[PDB]
Amino acid sequence: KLKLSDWFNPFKRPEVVTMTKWKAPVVWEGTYNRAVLDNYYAKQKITVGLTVFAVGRYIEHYLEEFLTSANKHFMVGHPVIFYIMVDDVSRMPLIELGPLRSFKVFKIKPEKRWQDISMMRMKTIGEHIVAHIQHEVDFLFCMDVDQVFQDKFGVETLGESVAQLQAWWYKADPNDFTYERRKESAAYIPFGEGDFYYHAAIFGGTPTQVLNITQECFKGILKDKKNDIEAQWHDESHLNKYFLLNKPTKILSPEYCWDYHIGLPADIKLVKMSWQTKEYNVVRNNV
Numbered sequence: 482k483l484k485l486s487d488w489f490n491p492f493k494r495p496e497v498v499t500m501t502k503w504k505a506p507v508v509w510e511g512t513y514n515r516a517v518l519d520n521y522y523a524k525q526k527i528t529v530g531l532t533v534f535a536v537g538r539y540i541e542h543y544l545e546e547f548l549t550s551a552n553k554h555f556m557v558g559h560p561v562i563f564y565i566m567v568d569d570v571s572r573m574p575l576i577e578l579g580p581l582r583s584f585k586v587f588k589i590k591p592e593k594r595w596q597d598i599s600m601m602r603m604k605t606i607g608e609h610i611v612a613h614i615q616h617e618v619d620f621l622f623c624m625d626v627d628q629v630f631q632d633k634f635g636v637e638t639l640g641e642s643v644a645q646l647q648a649w650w651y652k653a654d655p656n657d658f659t660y661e662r663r664k665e666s667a668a669y670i671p672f673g674e675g676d677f678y679y680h681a682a683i684f685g686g687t688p689t690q691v692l693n694i695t696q697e698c699f700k701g702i703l704k705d706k707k708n709d710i711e712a713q714w715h716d717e718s719h720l721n722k723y724f725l726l727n728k729p730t731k732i733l734s735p736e737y738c739w740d741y742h743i744g745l746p747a748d749i750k751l752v753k754m755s756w757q758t759k760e761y762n763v764v765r766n767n768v
């Protein structure tokens with residue numbers, strides 16, 4: 482009972498892509514009416530869930546910062562449930578959560594190669610969606626732990642299936658995108674194809690859609706393994722292959738996952754989430 486024109490105005494940001502050829506909106510600062518959305522949603526008594534993994538030193542290095550900022554900026558004004566996946570619960574920080582925030586922690590198995598830790602998330606999120614998340618929330622977001630919220634990340638980002646535009650390529654042409662280019666991988670995307678380059682650090686939608694996103698990405702990750710090949714950018718490559726075949730119903734602008742190392746060009750008006758500086762030497766133990 483909600484139409485796009487009710488809360489989305491592409492004309493507010495005329496200098497940037499605000500609509501896809503499949504009529505899906507790309508939410509940029511200034512184009513959305515959060516107040517109209519907060520009311521509409523408050524009446525449906527929606528609950529928004531957020532999953533975040535932290536295995537190894539990713540725990541001590543980023544979990545607290547992520548959770549403290551999520552608590553303060555994520556879906557404010559609505560019930561939110563944080564789903565924390567760690568390999569060692571003893572090192573999990575218990576920050577104080579505010580109104581309408583609550584959480585739960587699960588201990589998971591730590592995979593050997595950081596590449597599998599990142600890729601296994603797909604299998605695990607799905608298991609939890611079927612087991613419980615599908616019964617506790619209306620929309621779900623799955624994010625990387627190595628980032629922090631800088632401002633309101635609200636209901637204007639909700640949708641069937643939501644994708645995030647990676648900050649370094651939102652202006653590049655598809656043939657410049659770092660898609661997997663080997664036809665031997667399930668993630669393969671031929672030159673001449675592609676809409677955008679999606680970032681794996683943020684994606685979401687209804688539990689059902691996210692269940693399908695992850696199941697499909699994991700089938701793809703498993704297949705490559707049987708074929709002795711590994712996607713160039715792992716799950717992101719698979720995710721991009723997936724969002725190609727199944728266009729997202731909503732796309733978030735780089736303002737929702739920005740990397741300050743790029744600086745801050747005219748297009749990024751109000752950063753809502755920023756990348757943590759990479760510390761691979763400390764947080765990773767391989768390759």
Ligand SMILES: O=c1ccn([C@@H]2O[C@H](COP(=O)(O)OP(=O)(O)O)[C@@H](O)[C@H]2O)c(=O)[nH]1
Binds near residue numbers: 539596765
């Ligand atoms: O040893 C590891 C490798 C990855 N991750 C998780 O997987 C996500 C994606 O990985 P990473 O941050 O290494 O990806 P990048 O954005 O740097 O490609 C991270 O945010 C973490 O939540 C983790 O917990 N432990």
Ligand SMILES: OC[C@H]1O[C@@H](O[C@H]2[C@H](O)[C@@H](O)[C@H](O)O[C@@H]2CO)[C@H](O)[C@@H](O)[C@H]1O
Binds near residue numbers: 647649680714717
């Ligand atoms: O290629 C996808 C890959 O990008 C990494 O970020 C790169 C960026 O692509 C590159 O153009 C720039 O020069 O350096 C960045 C590294 O700081 C992401 O970190 C990775 O997660 C993928 O999204």
Ligand SMILES: [Mn+2]
Binds near residue numbers: 625626627682
């Ligand atoms: Mn990351």
